[PDB]
Amino acid sequence: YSWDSYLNDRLLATNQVSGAGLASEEDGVVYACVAQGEESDPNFDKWSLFYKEDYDIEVEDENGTKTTKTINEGQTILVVFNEGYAPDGVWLGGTKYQFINIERDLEFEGYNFDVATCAKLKGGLHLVKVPGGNILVVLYDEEKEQDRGNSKIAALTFAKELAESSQLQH
């Protein structure tokens, strides 16, 4: 597909998320995305929310020790599903999110899902493994009448649609 159409009609049309993308499970790199930017900003760059090439960050531990870490953003998404923790945080689009929770085999209306949630200032994201070996990335923005609970139901509802038609395979 051109996944943009689909993401917009099925997910962004809800008004419950600020953005949505698909990542490959192989590298965790978002390859299709939409952002509610629209009003909003018309020269708004949706990719700015979802993609950023490898960069170094400076970290200071409690000791006062300063190190550099090279952030590969996709990898920070894979570590949460692969290991169940985030040694560096989850980074997306240059923004740091805090890993709050992972729920494996969460039951949503007939289907099971691995779903992770991370937080930023006045927002966050949900990550859901969906078929085709994809990760669904959903953003929410508390300044836009969105919240963590409703964006997650919205992410799960979209994942269920994908899981259902993935089972028409003929």
Q: After which residues is the chain broken (C to N over 2.5 A)?
A: none
**Dist CA 49 CA 45 (whole Å):** 8
Do residues 60 and 66 lie in contact, with contact meaning Cβ atoms separated by under 8 Å?
A: yes
- Fold that domain 1-170 belongs to in CATH: Beta-Lactamase (3.30.450)
Please tell me what resolution, in angstroms, this structure has: 2.3
Do residues 89 and 76 lie in contact, with contact meaning Cβ atoms separated by under 8 Å?
A: yes
Query: How many whole angstroms from its chain centre is CA 90?
Result: 10
DSSP H/E element including 93: none
Phi, psi of 42 (to 5 degrees): -110, -20
Q: Residue 30: beta bridge partners?
A: 23
Q: Residue 99: beta bridge partners?
A: 118
What residue type is 57 in one-letter code? I
Q: Where are the domains of the chain?
A: 1-170
**b/e burial code for range 134-163 (CB count within 10 A of at least 16 → b):** bbbbbbbbeeeebebeebbebbbebbbebb
**Dist CA 161 CA 101 (whole Å):** 23
Q: Is 124 exposed, middle or buried (0-12, 13-18, 19+ CB in 10 A)?
A: buried
What does 46-87 look like in DSSP terms, one character per residue?
A: GGGGT----EEEEEE-TTS-EEEEEE-HHHHHHHHHHTSS-T
Do residues 96 and 88 lie in contact, with contact meaning Cβ atoms separated by under 8 Å?
A: no
**Dist CA 165 CA 147 (whole Å):** 28
**Dist CA 80 CA 125 (whole Å):** 13
Q: Max CA-CA distance within the chain?
A: 59
